[PDB]
A paper describes a structure:
In this study, we combined negative stain and cryoelectron microscopy (cryo-EM) single-particle approaches with X-ray crystallographic studies of early and late autologous Env-antibody complexes to decipher molecular details of the co-evolution of [name] Env and the immune system response over the course of several years of chronic infection. Comparison of Ab-Env complexes at early and late time points reveals that, within the antibody lineage, the CDRH3 loop rigidifies, the bnAb angle of approach steepens, and surface charges are mutated to accommodate glycan changes.
The overall structure of the late Fab was similar to the early Fab, apart from CDRH3, which at the early time point adopts a β-hairpin at the base but is “splayed” at the tip, resulting in a very different paratope. Consistent with computational predictions that sulfotyrosines are common in earlier antibodies from this lineage, we observe a sulfated tyrosine at position 100I of the early Fab CDRH3 (Landais et al., 2017). Due to the disordered residues at the tip of the CDRH3 of the early Fab, we were unable to confirm whether any of the other tyrosines in the region are sulfated. To further investigate the potential N130 glycan binding pocket in the early Fab, electrostatic charge potentials were mapped onto the surfaces of the Fabs, revealing a shift from positive to negative charge near the apparent binding pocket for the glycan. When the PC64 Fab structures were positioned in the cryo-EM maps, the splayed CDRH3 topology of the early antibody would create a larger interacting surface compared to the later time point antibody.
Numbering used by the authors:
A (entry chain L): 1 to 27, 27A, 28 to 94, 96 to 213
B (entry chain H): 1 to 52, 52A, 52B, 52C, 53 to 82, 82A, 82B, 82C, ...
Write the structure that this text describes.
């Protein structure tokens, strides 16, 4: 069965720029089987292009499709603000599959995250558990990462994070990470730190606290 | 107007069963196929199955991950397609859409039927949500993320809305009067099967002794409503 791959994962462009999105098929397909979809948060997908190059009814002229064989391209001749969205290619030649999606986000200048660490609250400790939170605020582009250390030991498997959508005014992202510990483990150790990497930092950032100080 | 409406979603235990319906209006399935497509939280699109038009005999095809467990069928008298879902798995959790293509022909006057302008566009329902989980209903704890004038990077504060099931929770600040600097993050699903959501605000550090910040949390499934005043430590 045919696998569709898309590159890049995220394309960062300004309104008014030409966008070029790539779809590759793991087996060659005839053009009649290749389509492109757009999807915005909270909405069903919308067909843009079918048969590799035909516009669906009501789709603006700035969207076009090209390519053949194993290599297909969606072009947006001039990006409008409503075009920052996720784009999926799709094929019906062998079964029916989608590509993984390319997100088109708004390009802005690099902004380093501001980092904040929060110990478990006294209320949570009374309730019997312990969560440490690290906030990475208002950064661009999206590729900020965070790791946790407890008494200088890197943690694995006990953290979860999520990320906001791009801000409508300043075009930044924010990310929060939570380290989940048992209360006994939290009381067993002293130094809690999150280490943050991002291309806007002159050096990675550590925020830390000592339990009970 | 051509329209599709999904129904029949819900919360179901692993191993359980649901039957989704896709009701068409403004057209029938005599010459139109019907696809089911799903989207897991934060993930891409995945085709689930297709039933062909009545003209093509209503043949069905299903994606490998659901073969033998999910079955598409149609009640022609109702213009409705069903998705019978058995042996449900936690990875079947998703929004389920039905979708089809609508062809229209504008035939040229004075020519024969081989001459026409062809129009094509898709139609999708709004979706129905399927959640497969072993967890039982639980309201969240609302824990403060306390600021400090010595922890500036502005100051930051928040609420950790921890250990609830099912979705959703809503969070506002100061009864909706405060949105500047607010970030409310997507919920995460913990290894326990309970959800957790964080909401934060960045604020001036030099007014923490006189400004009030309250997060307003509502978890309707458990009738939990909690306002948590977040104070400096």
């Amino acid at each position: 069965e045919i696998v569709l791959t898309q590159s890049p994962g995220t394309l960062s462009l300004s309104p008014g720029e030409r966008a070029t999105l790539s779809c590759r098929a793991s087996q060659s397909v005839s053009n009649n089987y290749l389509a492109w979809y757009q999807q915005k948060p909270g909405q069903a997908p919308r067909l843009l292009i079918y048969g590799a190059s035909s516009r669906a009814t009501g789709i603006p002229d700035r969207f076009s499709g090209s390519g053949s064989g194993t290599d297909f391209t969606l072009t947006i001749s001039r990006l409008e603000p409503e075009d920052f969205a996720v784009y999926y290619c799709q094929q019906s030649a062998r079964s029916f599959t989608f590509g993984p999606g390319t997100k088109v986000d708004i390009k802005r200048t690099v902004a380093a995250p501001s980092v904040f660490i929060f110990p478990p609250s006294d209320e949570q400790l009374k309730s019997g558990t312990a969560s440490v939170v690290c906030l990475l605020n208002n950064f661009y582009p999206r590729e900020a990462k965070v790791q946790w250390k407890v008494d200088n030991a890197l943690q694995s498997g006990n953290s979860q994070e999520s990320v906001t959508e791009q801000d409508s005014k300043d075009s930044t992202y924010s990310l929060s990470s939570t380290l989940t510990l048992s209360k006994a483990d939290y009381e067993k150790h002293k130094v809690y730190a999150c280490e943050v990497t991002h291309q806007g930092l002159s050096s990675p950032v550590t925020k830390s606290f000592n339990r009970g100080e | 107007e051509v329209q599709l409406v999904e129904s029949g979603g819900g919360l179901v235990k692993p191993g359980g069963s649901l039957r989704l319906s896709c009701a068409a209006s403004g057209f029938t399935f005599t010459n139109a196929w019907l696809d089911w497509v799903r989207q897991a939280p934060g993930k891409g699109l995945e085709w689930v199955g297709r039933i062909k038009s009545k003209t093509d005999g209503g043949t069905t095809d299903h994606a490998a991950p659901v073969k033998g467990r999910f079955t598409i069928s149609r009640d022609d008298s109702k213009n409705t397609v069903y998705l019978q879902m058995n042996s449900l798995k936690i990875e079947d959790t998703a929004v389920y859409y039905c979708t089809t293509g609508v062809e229209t022909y504008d035939f040229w006057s004075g020519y024969d039927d081989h001459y026409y302008d062809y129009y094509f566009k898709d139609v999708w329902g709004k979706g129905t949500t399927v959640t497969v989980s072993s967890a039982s209903t639980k309201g969240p704890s609302v824990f403060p993320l306390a600021p400090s004038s010595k922890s500036t990077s502005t100051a930051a504060l928040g609420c950790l809305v921890k250990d609830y099931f099912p979705e959703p929770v809503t969070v506002s600040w100061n009864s909706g009067a405060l949105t500047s600097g607010v970030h409310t993050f997507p919920a995460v699903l913990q290894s326990s099967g309970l959800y957790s959501l964080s909401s934060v605000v960045t604020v001036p550090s030099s007014s923490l002794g006189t400004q009030t910040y309250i997060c307003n949390v509502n978890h309707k499934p458990s009738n939990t409503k909690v306002d948590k005043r977040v104070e400096p430590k």
